[PDB]
Design a protein around this nucleic acid. Structure first.
Lengths: 80, 130, 210, 104, 153, 102, 60
RNA sequence: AAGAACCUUACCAGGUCUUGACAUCCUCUGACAAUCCUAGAGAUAGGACGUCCCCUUCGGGGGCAGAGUGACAGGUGGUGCAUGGUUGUCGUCAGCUCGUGUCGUGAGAUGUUGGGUUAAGUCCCGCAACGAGCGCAACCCUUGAUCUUAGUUGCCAGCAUUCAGUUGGGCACUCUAAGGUGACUGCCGGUGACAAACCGGAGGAAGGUGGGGAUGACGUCAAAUCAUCAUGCCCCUUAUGACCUGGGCUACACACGUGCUACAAUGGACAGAACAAAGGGCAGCGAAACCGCGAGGUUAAGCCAAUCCCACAAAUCUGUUCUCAGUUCGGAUCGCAGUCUGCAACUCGACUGCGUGAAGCUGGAAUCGCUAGUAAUCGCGGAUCAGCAUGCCGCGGUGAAUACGU
């Protein structure tokens, strides 16, 4: 993105407006990988597509703009 | 309308010049730029001035050379080749010794096209030694 | 390792461009159109043996000047089948193409009809020496500077390498101003696809001018 | 750099890797010192019971290799090494020639 | 194939030099002949202005003390050969002198390879040094084996 | 100055259709008035584009088909409106591009 | 997968940057010519048999 | 591979469907389908909105779609030791064969060997052989010389014209592609068994196949390809098939392979000036103007293109300066900050800013390519292609040394 702007997931934007709207929902799968974490979508758990199964990622406060699919591990390590 | 002088257009490596040498005093600056204005200096200007220094060595009449094409040896070598052939059109008997002091043939040494799988038309592909 | 398109090697230097057309802001509809009409006569020639199919682009109307060995075999019963498959091609590509006809005699001078017809004439249980010598006698005796026909590959089942290129007479295979007709076909028998490739170098035309 | 071995259609067994590796240890058991020797081997008895081997050793400034067929597939390795015998003795003798003489 | 000879060059910029025209033909590296013409003309003004003397006499005495005579042509029956004595031909003379004076003098290490190369040719003007030391070097290796490999060729 | 001269420029696949077809295209310019200009020869541009001439391997052994397409031009001088509208009777060639550019 | 591969490559793309080029006579990927409208093998064989003007080759 | 963020994609995980994504055929209804909404990350599943023929005189004809319904469809599965087709090298090296005849019980040979000469089994001459085939060559294209045709957007001498061949004008020159001409040992001096060829010279733009390209002999390697395509058999089929999201093909103790950029003063940074050729451009190129250091943004004249754009060439020349050092060299790594492309640049596009400044001071044994516009070197354009070049294919610029000899 360059200027307009940070590209939200859409489906993750609906789940973030809903679960971040109220009640502070618990972590489930979220098969998207496109955008980052959001301002209001913090706190939750993204069990995003690690390729085989999910991986519980924290909705932290340090990775403000960092990619929500970047927190997961892509290729199975390590290693030799 | 001027004196009957050289106008001989010849090429050398994709740079054909049009030397127009009138009855003059030795002024060789073609296309509005002098020999020290077009491409200085550089002691190869003596090589681009030798063919006028060979047709009895020399007149010297004027020099007006419209040279467009090639590079340093293209514009310069085409200028000396054009004033050499058209300079053969200056004096009608100048081809006796001027034809034997080089001063012709427009060598045409341009780039060779590389084949399908060559480096630069001379660079070989590679060697896997061992 | 060499082998070369004789029919593409001599094409454009002495041979004729078999596909004529203007070109063009849209070369794609021309290229696929000419391929599709080439398979149009290709499908419609199961027994006619059209030895060439030239199509000309003529401002929203194709001129598919289909050649044929025997005239009435594709020419219809006095205009029936030619108008039928012709108009059907008009609603097959989208352009009302007034397809003409052609009568190719001298089958030893026709490359693909004589060679491919020799191949399908081999697909009926005919032997390799009988098929190759028979085509060399009919088309090889029909009149030409030299015809050399070979059926290369599977024939006889096992140890598949079989190359009987039996053919005699002169051949301008490397003579670049020869203009030989040389195209192959592919026959598919029960043992395997064991096709044939033969060319008939009929004779060159001397270059002149005025 | 020495003694990489790979093979299609088969395992990369260490009882095949040391089996080829000891037997290819005869040449550098015998020569001076090299760093070389990639090996290829595969096949079976799908048709006409074969096992192609082809072992290359381009170390002594000009290449040398061989190739043989068998079904037994261990007994073609020996028939690769003793193929390399003459190629590695005739690399050294042929070149180790003392027929030199001036005016005698 | 036979002896297929080569062509020479024309007279130089300053002034009418021909062997020094070959000196400019060796003077460049990587094609750009303008930089070689500049460094060569800088050696001409540096050695003809500084160290007050002429030019064609200075180069004629440098390469005149640089153009060798004998040289080493290898051979043998095989292992442990004999480096034979093989004297130079003329164009091999000027070529070998251009190789020794160029490849020795341009690798000196002064403030510039142009002025420092002129200092290497000026030290070569004393009949010794880098280039003259090489002419004595090959001139000394040959004639060390000039009693055995002389009448073989 | 002059008038905007009516002349159709030719484009062809080979070079003989523009030559001979430009000849009979001058045969349309003999009638219809006068002043049909001669063969202003176009630049004759080509295209050279090669593909990998093997099935899978042999990446060095390529092949380079290249097919050029350029034809001459003709621009008439005298107007002749009856022949100018009569230029639509174009019969040849099979492969040729006529376009009245005026 | 020639039928689903080439047939799916004939269908409508997902995004606008999804439509990738396909093979002309044989639906191969990998360098179908966009100006001649054919593949590499298709341009070679169909061009040598006669497809448009013209040959091909060997200037330059 | 002439282009991997998804598609590509075959491979993995997950969710799906089983005459199926694509086709023919029987019946059968329908003109089909689209457009939004929801749930889903998606394929999909539900709705609502919606559709509801061109030709007969009813029986139609006709695709389209749906269903049954099995005949079928599929495989980028296995077999390149079943194959066709195609392609490498041996190699542009000059060979490779046959008809007839003769020899020899035979296989075979002879021709094709001998004498010269060539790049050549090229040519000539002897010869128990005489002939022909593919090869060699030439014919084809390009390249340096011109003639003739023909001058527009290209060229501008000869006139007026300006910032601008730009514009009245002009078709001399250059240039443009058609026909030709020109080089073929042609000619002379010889050498040579007269013949073959070979040494030397004039003349010419060009001399002994001008330079280069295309062109690759039978055969070899069971060489490469069932994955460009087609195809014999075997095997799978409510899954080795089909659809979708994400990932991977880009991983990383390590060894190689081919290239780029460097290690530096013939250099590094700047300022000014000068020289090309080639190709592409309508689903496109993008002028000028302003904005942004910047990459680029905005709008917009023009160009379907010898006119306009890409476009400015760069190495090179003239001055300042760095001065021998891991540096005012070189450039990775990596951080922050922006642009453009796209459904989306975190695995995984490039470019720009500020910063950072690895290792390298010409590289071992060994190994490579190279006969002149060549090596080497400096830039430009293009196929793929939304983006993505240090590769690939062409284009021009600077301009070398050596070949003693086998």
């Amino acid at each position: 993105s360059l200027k307009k702007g940070p590209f939200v997931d859409g489906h993750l934007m609906t789940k973030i407006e809903k679960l971040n709207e109220t009640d502070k929902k618990q972590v489930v799968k979220t098969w998207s990988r496109r955008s980052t974490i959001f301002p209001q979508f913090i706190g939750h758990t993204i069990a995003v597509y690690d390729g085989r199964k999910h991986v519980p990622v924290f909705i932290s406060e340090d990775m403000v703009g960092h990619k929500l699919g970047e927190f997961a591990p892509t290729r199975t390590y390590k290693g030799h | 309308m001027a004196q009957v002088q050289y106008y001989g257009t010849g090429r050398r490596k994709s740079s054909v010049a049009r030397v127009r040498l009138v009855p003059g005093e030795g002024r060789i600056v073609v296309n509005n730029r002098e020999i020290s204005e077009h491409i200085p200096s550089a002691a190869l200007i003596e090589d681009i001035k030798q063919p006028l220094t060979l047709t009895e060595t020399a007149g010297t009449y004027d020099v007006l050379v419209n040279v467009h094409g090639g590079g340093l040896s293209g514009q310069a070598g085409a200028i000396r080749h054009g004033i050499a052939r058209a300079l053969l059109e200056a004096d009608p008997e100048y081809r006796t010794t001027l034809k034997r002091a080089g001063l012709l043939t427009r060598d045409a040494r341009m780039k060779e096209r590389k084949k399908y799988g060559l480096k630069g038309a001379r660079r070989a592909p590679q060697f896997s030694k061992r | 390792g060499q082998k070369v398109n004789p029919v593409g090697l001599r094409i454009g230097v002495i041979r004729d461009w078999e596909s004529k057309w203007y070109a063009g802001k849209d070369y794609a509809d021309f290229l696929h159109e000419d391929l599709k009409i080439r398979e149009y006569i290709s499908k419609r020639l199961s027994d006619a043996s059209v030895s060439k199919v030239e199509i000309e682009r003529a401002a929203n109307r194709v001129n598919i000047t289909i050649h044929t060995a025997k005239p009435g075999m594709v020419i219809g019963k006095g205009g029936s089948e030619v108008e039928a498959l012709r108009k059907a091609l008009n609603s097959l590509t989208g352009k009302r193409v007034h397809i003409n006809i052609l009568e190719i005699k001298r089958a030893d001078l026709d490359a693909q009809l004589v060679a491919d017809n020799i191949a399908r004439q081999l697909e009926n249980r005919v032997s390799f020496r009988r098929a190759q010598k028979q085509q060399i006698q009919r088309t090889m005796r029909a009149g030409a500077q030299g015809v050399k026909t070979m059926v290369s590959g599977r024939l006889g089942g096992a140890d598949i390498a079989r190359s009987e290129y039996y053919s005699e007479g002169t051949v301008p295979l490397h003579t670049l101003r020869a203009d030989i007709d040389y195209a192959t076909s592919e026959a598919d028998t029960t043992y395997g696809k064991l096709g044939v490739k033969v060319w008939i170098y009929r004779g060159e035309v001397l270059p002149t001018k005025k | 750099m020495n003694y990489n071995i790979r093979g299609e259609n088969i395992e990369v067994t260490p009882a095949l890797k040391d089996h080829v590796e000891r037997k290819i240890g005869k040449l550098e058991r015998y020569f001076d010192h090299s760093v070389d020797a990639d090996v290829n081997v595969n096949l079976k008895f799908y048709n006409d019971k074969e096992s192609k081997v082809e072992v290359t050793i381009p170390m002594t400034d000009l290449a040398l290799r061989s190739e043989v067929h068998n079904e037994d597939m261990y007994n073609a390795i020996d028939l690769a090494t003793n193929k390399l015998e003459r190629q590695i003795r005739k690399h050294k003798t042929k070149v180790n020639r003392k027929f030199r003489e001036q005016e005698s | 194939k036979g002896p297929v000879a080569k062509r020479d060059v024309l007279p130089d910029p300053i002034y009418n030099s021909k062997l020094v025209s070959r000196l400019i033909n060796k003077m460049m590296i990587d094609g750009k002949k303008g930089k070689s013409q500049t460094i060569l003309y800088k050696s001409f003004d540096i050695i003809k202005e500084r160290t007050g003397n002429d030019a064609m006499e200075v180069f004629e005495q440098a390469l005149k003390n640089i153009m060798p005579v004998l040289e080493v042509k290898a051979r043998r029956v095989g292992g442990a050969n004999y480096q034979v004595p093989v004297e130079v031909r003329p164009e091999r003379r000027t070529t070998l002198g251009l190789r020794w004076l160029v490849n020795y003098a341009r690798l000196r290490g002064e403030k510039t390879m142009e002025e420092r190369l002129a200092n290497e040719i000026l030290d070569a003007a004393n009949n010794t040094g880098a280039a003259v030391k090489k002419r004595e070097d090959t001139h000394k290796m040959a004639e060390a084996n000039k009693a055995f490999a002389h009448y073989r060729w | 100055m002059a008038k905007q001269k009516i002349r159709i420029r030719l484009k062809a696949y080979d070079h003989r259709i523009l030559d001979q077809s430009a000849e009979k295209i001058v045969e349309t310019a003999k009638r219809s008035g006068a002043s049909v200009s001669g063969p202003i020869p176009l630049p004759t541009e080509k295209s050279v584009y090669t593909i990998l001439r093997a099935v899978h391997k042999y990446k060095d052994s390529r092949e380079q088909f290249e097919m050029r397409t350029h034809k001459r031009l003709i621009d008439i001088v005298n107007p002749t409106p009856q022949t100018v509208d009569a230029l639509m009777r174009l019969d040849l060639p099979s492969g040729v591009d006529i376009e009245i550019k005026l | 997968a020639k039928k689903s591969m080439i047939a799916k490559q004939q269908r409508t793309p997902k995004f606008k940057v999804q439509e990738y080029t396909r093979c002309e006579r044989c639906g191969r990927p990998h360098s179908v010519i966009r100006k001649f409208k054919l593949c590499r093998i298709c341009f070679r064989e169909l061009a040598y048999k006669g497809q448009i003007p013209g040959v091909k080759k060997a200037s330059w």
